[PDB]
Amino acid sequence: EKRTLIAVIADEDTTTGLLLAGIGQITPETQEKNFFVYQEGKTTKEEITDKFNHFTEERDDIAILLINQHIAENIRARVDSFTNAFPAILEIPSKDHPYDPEKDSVLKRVRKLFG
Amino acid sequence: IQLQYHSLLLIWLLTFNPVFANELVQKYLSDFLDLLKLVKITIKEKVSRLCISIILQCCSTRVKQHKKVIKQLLLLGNALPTVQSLSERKYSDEELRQDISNLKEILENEYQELTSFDEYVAELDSKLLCWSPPHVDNGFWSDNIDEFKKDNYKIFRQLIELLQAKVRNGDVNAKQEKIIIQVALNDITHVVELLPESIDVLDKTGGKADIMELLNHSDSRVKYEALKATQ
């Protein structure tokens, strides 16, 4: 296999728990952990975009991005400008914020053509 | 109630002529939704009927630029949600009911081709408020950053004049003055954050001096937005 890793940009309630019970958080020979804590009001938005680039372009093993809406709304331009296939960025709701099916990039594209 | 009914009758009589309504839209545009709000609060059947009739006359096809005026009214004054509520609401005035239904149809037609850009243009025309629609979220602003500037800041020179007027009012402590001082500086900071080329035009036009004066002294919101402008 060529590309298998799962990557999660989510608060501690998601990346640390839930899927982490069966998904893990560390790479076979890396310490990056393919995740970002994203402390509320602590992690920089520029640093958030840097981590998005890290897990989408800088390293190849990541098969999927699983990103919370909190970063996505502030990272809107970066994720909207990303048009590749392999990382398959996937937006998720977090905390109280629901899906909001009129915001995320992929579903925006789908409504753009053909419905 | 009698005074309000008389005022509504006078407004309707004046607005029966399309030219009068079109001219008033350029000076009393906010009054277009103010009358609708007064009717919505007003419980009198006849007064509400008169107010709805006046509103519909303002949107009458005879009135010059009827489509654009109706769209702007629906987008800004919430005339479309108000008409939806009126349709949901019930009244015994058959004439008032018909007038409200016609106003609702006009609002629906106006909103079928509506956009927040009209609200942004109206706010830029006002330039005497504290907050603007684009501050709601990062969605519309994503385009609005290059909307007022016309991709080159050329169309934004009107925004520059609006900010200059808001800064002239900023030296005073009036509630509208402080609101404008905050809003113009916040919009300037939002626009400058992307494509800083136009910032030079703002910088040459006194942008740095305006930011310094906003945070000079005797200001709370003016400095609160000059901090973002200079950051």
Curated annotation (Swiss-Prot), chain A:
GO cellular component, one term: vacuolar proton-transporting V-type ATPase, V1 domain
Coiled coil stretches, renumbered: none
Superkingdom assignment: Eukaryota
A Gene Ontology BP annotation from the UniProt entry: vacuolar acidification
Membrane-spanning ranges: none
An annotated Gene Ontology molecular function: proton-transporting ATPase activity, rotational mechanism
Pfam families: ATP-synt_F
Keyword Transcription part of the UniProt annotation: no
Keyword Membrane: yes
Localization in the cell: Vacuole membrane
Keywords: Hydrogen ion transport, Ion transport, Membrane, Transport, Vacuole
Record family assignment: Belongs to the V-ATPase F subunit family.
NCBIfam families (UniProt xref): V_ATP_synt_F (TIGR01101)
Other known facts: Present with 4050 molecules/cell in log phase SD medium.
Stated role: Subunit of the V1 complex of vacuolar(H+)-ATPase (V-ATPase), a multisubunit enzyme composed of a peripheral complex (V1) that hydrolyzes ATP and a membrane integral complex (V0) that translocates protons. V-ATPase is responsible for acidifying and maintaining the pH of intracellular compartments.
Assembly: V-ATPase is a heteromultimeric enzyme composed of a peripheral catalytic V1 complex (components A to H) attached to an integral membrane V0 proton pore complex (components: a, c, c', c'', d, e, f and VOA1).
Protein's recorded name: V-type proton ATPase subunit F
Curated annotation (Swiss-Prot), chain B:
Keywords, comma-separated and alphabetical: Hydrogen ion transport, Ion transport, Membrane, Transport, Vacuole
A GO term for molecular function: proton-transporting ATPase activity, rotational mechanism
Protein's GO biological process: endosomal lumen acidification; Golgi lumen acidification; proton transmembrane transport; vacuolar acidification
Keyword check for Transport: yes
Effect of loss of the gene: Increases the ATPase activity of membrane-detached V-ATPase V1. Abolishes growth at pH 7.5 and in the presence of calcium chloride, abrogates growth at pH 5.0.
Record's GO cellular component terms: fungal-type vacuole membrane; Golgi membrane; proton-transporting V-type ATPase complex; vacuolar proton-transporting V-type ATPase complex; vacuolar proton-transporting V-type ATPase, V1 domain
Coiled coil: none
Transmembrane stretches, start-end: none
Subcellular location: Vacuole membrane
Family statement drawn from the similarity comment of this UniProt entry: Belongs to the V-ATPase H subunit family.
Subunit details: V-ATPase is a heteromultimeric enzyme composed of a peripheral catalytic V1 complex (components A to H) attached to an integral membrane V0 proton pore complex (components: a, c, c', c'', d, e, f and VOA1). Interacts with YND1.
Stated role: Subunit of the V1 complex of vacuolar(H+)-ATPase (V-ATPase), a multisubunit enzyme composed of a peripheral complex (V1) that hydrolyzes ATP and a membrane integral complex (V0) that translocates protons. V-ATPase is responsible for acidifying and maintaining the pH of intracellular compartments. This subunit is essential for activity, but not assembly, of the enzyme complex. This subunit is also required for silencing the ATPase activity of V-ATPase when V1 is detached from V0.
Additional notes on this entry: Present with 22500 molecules/cell in log phase SD medium.
Protein name: V-type proton ATPase subunit H
Species the sequence originates in: Saccharomyces cerevisiae (strain ATCC 204508 / S288c)
Gene: VMA13
Residues of the full protein shown: 240 to 470 of 478
